[PDB]
Design a protein around this nucleic acid. Structure first.
Ligand SMILES: [Mg+2]
Ligand SMILES: [Mg+2]
Ligand SMILES: [Mg+2]
Ligand SMILES: [Mg+2]
Ligand SMILES: [Mg+2]
Ligand SMILES: [Mg+2]
Ligand SMILES: [Mg+2]
Ligand SMILES: [Mg+2]
Ligand SMILES: [Mg+2]
Ligand SMILES: [Mg+2]
Ligand SMILES: [Mg+2]
Ligand SMILES: [Mg+2]
Ligand SMILES: [Mg+2]
Ligand SMILES: [Mg+2]
Ligand SMILES: [Mg+2]
Ligand SMILES: [Mg+2]
Ligand SMILES: [Mg+2]
Ligand SMILES: [Mg+2]
Ligand SMILES: [Mg+2]
Ligand SMILES: [Mg+2]
Ligand SMILES: [Mg+2]
Ligand SMILES: [Mg+2]
Ligand SMILES: [Mg+2]
Ligand SMILES: [Mg+2]
Ligand SMILES: [Mg+2]
Ligand SMILES: [Mg+2]
Ligand SMILES: [Mg+2]
Ligand SMILES: [Mg+2]
Ligand SMILES: [Mg+2]
Ligand SMILES: [Mg+2]
Ligand SMILES: [Mg+2]
Ligand SMILES: [Mg+2]
Ligand SMILES: [Mg+2]
Ligand SMILES: [Mg+2]
Ligand SMILES: [Mg+2]
Ligand SMILES: [Mg+2]
Ligand SMILES: [Mg+2]
Ligand SMILES: [Mg+2]
Ligand SMILES: [Mg+2]
Ligand SMILES: [Mg+2]
Ligand SMILES: [Mg+2]
Ligand SMILES: [Mg+2]
Ligand SMILES: [Mg+2]
Ligand SMILES: [Mg+2]
Ligand SMILES: [Mg+2]
Ligand SMILES: [Mg+2]
Ligand SMILES: [Mg+2]
Ligand SMILES: [Mg+2]
Ligand SMILES: [Mg+2]
Lengths: 197, 193, 191, 136, 172
RNA sequence: UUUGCUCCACACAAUAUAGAUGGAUACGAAUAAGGCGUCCUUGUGGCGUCGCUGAACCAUAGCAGGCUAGCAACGGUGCACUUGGCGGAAAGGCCUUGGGUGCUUGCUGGCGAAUUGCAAUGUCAUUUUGCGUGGGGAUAAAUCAUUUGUAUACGACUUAGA
RNA sequence: GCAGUCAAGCGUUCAUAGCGACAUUGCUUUUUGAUUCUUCGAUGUCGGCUCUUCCUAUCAUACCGAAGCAGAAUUCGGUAA
RNA sequence: AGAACUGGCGAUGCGGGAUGAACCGAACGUAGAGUUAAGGUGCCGGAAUACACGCUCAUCAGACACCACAAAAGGUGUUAG
RNA sequence: GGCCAGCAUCAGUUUUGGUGGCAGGAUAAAUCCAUAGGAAUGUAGCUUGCCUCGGUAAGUAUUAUAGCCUGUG
């Protein structure tokens, strides 16, 4: 659709966000994912906490270096869920992965760029209301991630600025509407009506 | 954490400048010569760097160096190093350090008597070492063929790999250690019989 | 079998003005005010008049319906807590070593400080919660009295103290020592 | 200090609630909820629009804020009588929803030429509004 | 087994020289086609009479359309079913608009709640419950209460593109 | 070591491309609830309104977009200059000022287009590099060998030397 | 070898604190058997020494529930490698 | 370990069962276009994040024949009888 | 007439749509119309008891100031 798709992670389901991201990549669609720390996983926090520790215990016995690597950060968790959906050892595999970029919080470029959502991964649309689920941030911070507080902090500060930007825009689009209204009832306006506009 | 500026003093002791080189004698000693210019203009560009620090900067450290010439050592080439600054406020912190550019700081202004301090240093070296002294492994019995400062079983059959846990001959010494709780019994003073 | 609608009533007295947006509940009456967060629950509130509020659950399961009443319950207690208020009484119990209870404060604290429990050279402490206030009773021996607008904040502060004097390593039927919640009620009397 | 309890005021399944059928031979047509079968099925009838009396799953229909007098389980003729009586059609007609659906239907039916002239018009509008938007 | 039709089937025991005109028996049979429904007929008959398809004949097979296809009805339903451990009789009540609809959901409900596949179920009787308050099972009474209405809270639009630009709204 | 380095500029030349072909079009939060407008007592406030998809919004006509005239506007936009200010999460971008200049399809005119032959992507992007020219700027070091021993199997480490 | 279910009994009294007959359902693969699939142009035996790591059906240590737990001691159970 | 009848493997690739002598499907000259079998269709990965009714929330859920195990016995979890 | 294409008309194979005429059946079943009878998740009216001048409630009341059900045609 567009050269880059920035996805606001907040309110999405890891494995469903993953699954759609994978495909997009494999079809040429560069993606960047933001706020991976506001990502969800079905199931109570504790469950996924244990699920994570299960992953934790697997290591190359003779050398825990060569063995499986346990990335704690929400984006990195995400990549795992995603990478596992890509034949990432083909060249085609590596190729696709590279159009992808995951991020806790929303850092520059992307903040001023617009972000979208993936309805078929949107928790509030998918999960049966009543079911329990998990945020990535709390999970990750629970298994070592060192940076929840800073991201929250930087973001609140981002959110301040952006909420100005909006009010300022909302202000302008009131005028624009006001301008448009005086042009209502003109010949040209009735014409465009007539043609569906 | 990321470093976002370093602001430097104007005049730099040769002693430190020496640390910025591998071949002092031959070299034209041009280190920091352009940087010192940045002072000439009123102050202009150094202020904004200090300024920059103040506006951002969650922590502030100072670059100090040792006066190795006041020391019986032959080594001449001083030791430069960052020290975090823990007194009040970011701003006052960089105010402080700007005040101490070129100016000199005293031991007794950091340590008091009977204070518990820790010591961070690179351990004495010993080079290549047998398993027996490097790991404090039992001596093998005297009767044994092919040597006895060894470990008899380097591993069971599976996992079919020597493992990261078992002891092996290797380097010993020249290790970093942060060792703690050393109480200060004297804070000496040089100008003092 | 998914019940098509079941609802409850939350009665409102001549002193208070409960207000609820999203599912944030503010109850405000003579004794102050409490608020409590219900978002976790999926019920629908409905004013009918300044003395009545309905809360209901559409097409719900057993577990859902079952949480309907406990919301009526929870919100009720905010209303009474802000009208009558709550007052939990505990009375010390000891068969030799006089449990000695005091209130202390490090860094603007208020701590319930228990000394000599079964003699323990150890000095037990329990923070006083905010909302809850504590009079050692005149006229009644070894009685401690906790009181506030939040049932849940006085009951918990009570239970913190009662527990901190659990007995280890003894037959706890013969060693009945402790501080025990001895009466639960309201602050305003006649009722 | 009155009380202020939100609302959350849903459209309801009930006899005489009009629904827009969303897929099927009918689809796009309105119709009325007659009887009510279970939590997921309802009996509909939309005489004025051609849609056959039928059972249908609520999931295939979208509720509209429109309602009228309908005897529960009232047969097709009765349905038609009441409906015209209630003038539901021009009611829905006048709504934004319907006016919106109408719009995109027109947009969709434009000639390439018509399309080209839509542009010339937008340029024209755009000129005097961007002007307006700069004199106050 | 599929989407049902309801058939009358009439079979009758090949005549014999000494007994021409045998007795003629009918069964209403729910099945998705006549090849199945005839088969079911012979199934149940051999469970009641000395016969087998071999020695009998079908006389007629006819589909029986719902009398009032767009009228809502409360059905009582009577099933003999087989479980893993033993066999069981059962009474369910189904509310829909044709007997054929109702037999379709029954078969599902039995599959879902009791893990009863089609082979293991006998429909014993399906009959329209005339007077309400002869409706017994509550999950049906629920839908007979005057001036009844209900919301369908938490709406979910099926997105048609992978990406949305809004952020949705389960309002309704 | 044969006039080498660097930044800006254009020029030639190579070499490429995980895949331009109107526009990645910025609140936040909730979803058993919200956006917007308006009003007020500025609140968990009143009143109006919207959703049911971006099927939108913006842009879009001119030799792949030529050469030209005029009118009505005083608007829009590209460009290089300039004013004041914001942005350190990877700020490397955003906003505001003022004159200059181009274009304007807002409207009305004059010319041009063919033969690329009935289609042939019919070439309009952006990567890195090399070589001259001249518009600014800048004039180091590391290695060997020698040497110390806070180091060392050899390399490595750590000193020292106009 | 280890762990259950039923509960007649045992335990002054009292089935189940702690035990538990007659039965009966299991698990385990450091017992021994049964098998003979791989190795007979060769996979170095028993034990000890040394050293690492793993299992838990936990002997100790941490925190707990139970007792035919007064105290002390002990026993049963849980989270625990 | 040993018989009966057939079909197979051995002697046989090809599609499916991730993997695999014997299961499912189907038996091979070189190829084009079509349709399928067994088995599939969120992503890996061709192919509906299809439709429909229920059920199920597991602090070691479950997830498709051969097949890569679980039983007696219990539950005031929930479902229908 | 060497190479490679484009389109047209056809042929073999095939895939995917639009549309016309018929035959069955309870000569579909329904809706619809007519007609008889009925009931309640009882419409009008009536009664009665509170209730800010009617609205509620609980009684009668079978088409009235809604309608539905069943059979027959
Ligand atoms: Mg900088
Ligand atoms: Mg040695
Ligand atoms: Mg030793
Ligand atoms: Mg030692
Ligand atoms: Mg040893
Ligand atoms: Mg020897
Ligand atoms: Mg004990
Ligand atoms: Mg004891
Ligand atoms: Mg019938
Ligand atoms: Mg490439
Ligand atoms: Mg609103
Ligand atoms: Mg507003
Ligand atoms: Mg409001
Ligand atoms: Mg828009
Ligand atoms: Mg032009
Ligand atoms: Mg022109
Ligand atoms: Mg970036
Ligand atoms: Mg040059
Ligand atoms: Mg030496
Ligand atoms: Mg017995
Ligand atoms: Mg006893
Ligand atoms: Mg006895
Ligand atoms: Mg036994
Ligand atoms: Mg053993
Ligand atoms: Mg053997
Ligand atoms: Mg051998
Ligand atoms: Mg061999
Ligand atoms: Mg050998
Ligand atoms: Mg060997
Ligand atoms: Mg292990
Ligand atoms: Mg254990
Ligand atoms: Mg006893
Ligand atoms: Mg325990
Ligand atoms: Mg261990
Ligand atoms: Mg372990
Ligand atoms: Mg076979
Ligand atoms: Mg052979
Ligand atoms: Mg074969
Ligand atoms: Mg294969
Ligand atoms: Mg398998
Ligand atoms: Mg994969
Ligand atoms: Mg696919
Ligand atoms: Mg089976
Ligand atoms: Mg069982
Ligand atoms: Mg059960
Ligand atoms: Mg050709
Ligand atoms: Mg042809
Ligand atoms: Mg036809
Ligand atoms: Mg009516």
């Amino acid at each position: 659709v567009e050269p880059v798709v920035v996805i606001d992670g907040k309110g999405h389901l890891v494995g469903r966000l993953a699954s759609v991201v994978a495909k997009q990549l494999l079809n040429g669609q560069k993606i960047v994912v933001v706020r991976a720390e506001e990502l969800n996983i079905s199931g109570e926090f504790f469950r996924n906490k244990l699920k994570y520790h299960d992953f934790l215990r697997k290591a190359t016995a003779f050398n825990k270096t060569r063995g499986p690597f346990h990335f704690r950060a929400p984006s990195r968790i995400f990549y795992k869920a995603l990478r596992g959906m890509v034949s990432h050892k083909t060249a085609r595999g590596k190729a696709a992965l590279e159009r992808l970029k995951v991020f806790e919080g929303i850092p520059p470029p992307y903040d001023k760029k617009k972000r979208v959502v993936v309805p078929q991964a949107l928790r509030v649309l998918r999960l049966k209301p009543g079911r329990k689920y998990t945020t990535l941030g709390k999970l990750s911070t629970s298994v070592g991630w060192k940076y929840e507080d800073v991201v929250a902090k930087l973001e609140a500060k981002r959110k301040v600025s952006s909420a100005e930007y909006y009010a300022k825009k909302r202000a302008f689009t009131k005028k624009v509407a006001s301008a448009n209204a005086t042009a209502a009832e003109s010949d040209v306006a009735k014409q465009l009506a007539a043609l569906g506009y | 954490l990321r470093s976002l500026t370093t602001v430097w003093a104007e005049h730099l002791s040769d002693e430190v400048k020496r640390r910025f080189y591998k071949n002092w004698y031959k070299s034209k000693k041009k280190a920091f010569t352009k940087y010192s210019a940045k002072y000439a203009q009123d102050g202009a560009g150094i202020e904004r760097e200090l300024a920059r620090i103040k506006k951002y900067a969650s922590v502030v450290r100072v670059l100090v160096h040792t006066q190795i010439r006041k020391t019986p050592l032959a080594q001449k080439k001083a030791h430069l190093a960052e020290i975090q600054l823990n007194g009040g406020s970011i701003s006052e912190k960089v105010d402080w350090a700007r005040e101490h550019f070129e100016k000199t700081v005293a031991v007794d202004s950091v340590f008091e008597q009977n204070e518990m301090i820790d010591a961070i240093a690179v351990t004495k070296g010993h080079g290549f070492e047998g398993v027996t002294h490097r790991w404090g492994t039992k001596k093998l019995p005297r009767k044994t063929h092919r040597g006895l400062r060894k470990v008899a079983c380097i591993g069971a059959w599976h996992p079919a790999h020597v493992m990261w846990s078992v002891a092996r001959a290797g380097q010993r010494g020249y290790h970093s250690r942060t060792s703690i709780n050393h109480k200060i019994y004297r804070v000496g003073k040089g100008d003092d019989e | 079998m998914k019940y098509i609608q079941t609802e409850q009533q939350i009665e409102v007295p001549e002193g208070v003005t409960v207000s609820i947006k999203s599912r944030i509940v503010k109850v405000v009456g003579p004794r102050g005010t409490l608020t409590k967060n219900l978002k976790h629950i999926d019920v629908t509130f409905t004013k009918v008049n300044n003395q009545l509020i309905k809360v209901a659950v559409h097409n719900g399961g057993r577990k859902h319906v079952a949480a309907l009443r406990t919301v009526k319950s929870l919100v009720d207690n905010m209303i009474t807590g802000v009208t009558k208020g709550y007052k939990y009484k505990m009375r010390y119990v000891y068969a030799h070593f006089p449990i000695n209870v005091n209130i202390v404060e490090k860094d603007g604290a208020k701590f319930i400080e228990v000394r000599n429990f079964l003699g323990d050279k150890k000095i037990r402490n329990v923070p006083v919660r905010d909302g809850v206030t504590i009079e050692f009773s005149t006229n009644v021996k070894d009685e401690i009295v906790l009181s506030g607008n939040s049932v849940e904040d006085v009951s918990q502060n009570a239970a913190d103290l009662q527990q901190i004097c659990r007995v280890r390593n003894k037959d706890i039927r013969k060693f009945l020592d402790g501080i025990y919640v001895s009466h639960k009620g309201f602050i305003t009397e006649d009722l | 200090t009155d009380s202020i309890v939100k609302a959350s005021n849903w459209r309801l399944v009930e006899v005489g609630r009009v629904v827009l059928i969303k897929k099927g031979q009918s689809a796009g047509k309105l119709a009325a909820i007659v009887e009510i079968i279970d939590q997921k099925k309802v009996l509909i009838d939309g005489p004025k629009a051609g849609v056959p009396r039928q059972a249908i799953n609520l999931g295939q229909v979208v509720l509209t804020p429109l309602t009228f007098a309908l005897p529960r389980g009232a047969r097709t003729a009765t349905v038609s009588k009441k409906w015209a009586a209630a003038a539901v059609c021009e009611k829905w007609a006048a709504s934004s929803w319907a006016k919106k659906i109408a719009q995109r239907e027109r947009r969709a039916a434009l000639t390439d030429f018509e399309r080209f002239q839509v542009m010339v018009l937008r340029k024209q509008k755009r000129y005097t509004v961007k002007k307006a938007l700069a004199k106050a | 087994m599929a989407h049902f039709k309801e058939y009358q089937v009439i079979g009758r025991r090949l005549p014999t020289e000494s007994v021409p005109e045998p007795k003629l028996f009918r069964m209403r049979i729910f099945a998705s086609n006549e090849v199945i429904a005839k088969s079911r007929y012979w199934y149940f008959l051999q469970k009641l009479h000395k016969v087998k398809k071999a020695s009998g004949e079908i006389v007629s097979i006819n589909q029986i359309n719902e009398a009032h296809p767009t009228k809502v009805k409360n059905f009582g339903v009577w099933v003999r079913y087989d479980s893993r451990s033993g066999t069981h009789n059962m009474y369910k009540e189904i509310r829909d608009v044709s007997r054929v609809a109702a037999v379709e959901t029954l078969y599902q409900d039995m599959a879902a709640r009791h893990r009863a596949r089609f082979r293991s179920i006998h429909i014993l009787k399906v009959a329209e419950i005339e007077k309400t308050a002869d409706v017994k099972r509550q999950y049906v009474k629920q839908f007979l209460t005057k001036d009844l209405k209900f919301p369908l809270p938490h709406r979910v639009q099926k997105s048609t593109k992978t990406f949305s630009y809004k952020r949705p709204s389960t309002f309704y």
